[PDB]
Ligand binder design. Structure first.
Ligand SMILES: *C(=O)CCCCCCCCCCCCC
Lengths: 204, 40
């Protein structure tokens, strides 16, 4: 349990492209997937929204054990009958109503926010929360298209220098931060495909 | 101008001569662990 606070654990996270070849045949490509060293959070504040409700504000309110930074190496090697989706799965000892807010940022400025409300299902002594096949926003689809149409892979990483995603999972009723994940991206250059590393965000 | 302008963001790398975006410190020059830049 890497991406886990005391109240919530993200077991799975993935963004994907699914293509329907025919009514019985589906092909799925994963851009990124999850299935701990410390980073000084001050080093990344400029890359995320600030002011009230922003990254610094959220971190100061805590708990400090809810705060993570994930570095992805995205797999963009892939080709009417397409679906861009995001799937994620969470577990908690507690029966809560959770809200998941995902903010896409450019130069630390919010471009778009997607918000989802999730209810618990009882599962083997704990409660499970699943965001299943959530539609990726048009902005993200277009961003991927524009990336893939860049002549050089260094240009892709250059663009991705100033592109971040912030995911905040909250208890809707109490507003407690259950998980806060800052995402940073590079393009995968490996034979392995998509890769990741997970860090704890610390005050200093 | 707009900082969230998607075209400008991509134009800045495709056509550096006409780049009109905020100037920033590259991640590789920041105080970050080695694991941040080396994939597993
Ligand atoms: C729009 O509604 C914002 C939702 C963004 C969800 C995060 C999915 C991560 C996308 C990874 C694709 C790789 C892009 C370089």
């Amino acid at each position: 349990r890497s991406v886990a606070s005391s109240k919530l654990w993200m077991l799975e996270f993935s963004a994907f492209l699914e293509q329907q070849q025919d009514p019985d045949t589906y092909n799925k490509h994963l851009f990124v997937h999850i299935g701990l060293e410390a980073v000084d959070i001050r080093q990344i504040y400029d890359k995320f929204p600030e002011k009230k409700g922003g990254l610094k504000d959220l971190f100061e309110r805590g708990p400090s054990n809810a705060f993570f930074l994930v570095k992805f190496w995205a797999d963009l090697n892939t080709n009417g009958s397409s679906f861009y989706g995001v799937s994620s799965q969470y577990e908690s000892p507690e029966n809560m109503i959770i809200t998941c807010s995902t903010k896409v940022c450019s130069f630390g400025k919010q471009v778009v926010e997607k918000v989802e409300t999730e209810y618990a299902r009882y599962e083997n002594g704990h409660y499970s929360y699943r965001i299943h096949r959530s539609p990726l926003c048009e902005y993200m689809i277009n961003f991927i298209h524009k990336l893939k149409h860049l002549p050089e892979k260094y240009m892709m990483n250059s663009v991705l220098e100033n592109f971040t995603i912030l995911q905040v999972v909250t208890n809707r009723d109490t507003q407690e931060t259950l998980l806060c994940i800052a995402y940073v991206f590079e393009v995968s250059a490996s034979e392995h495909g998509a890769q990741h590393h997970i860090f704890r965000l610390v005050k200093e | 101008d707009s900082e969230t302008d998607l075209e400008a963001l991509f134009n800045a790398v495709m056509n550096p001569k006409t780049a009109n975006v905020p100037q920033t410190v590259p991640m590789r020059l920041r105080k970050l662990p080695d694991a941040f830049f080396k994939p597993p």
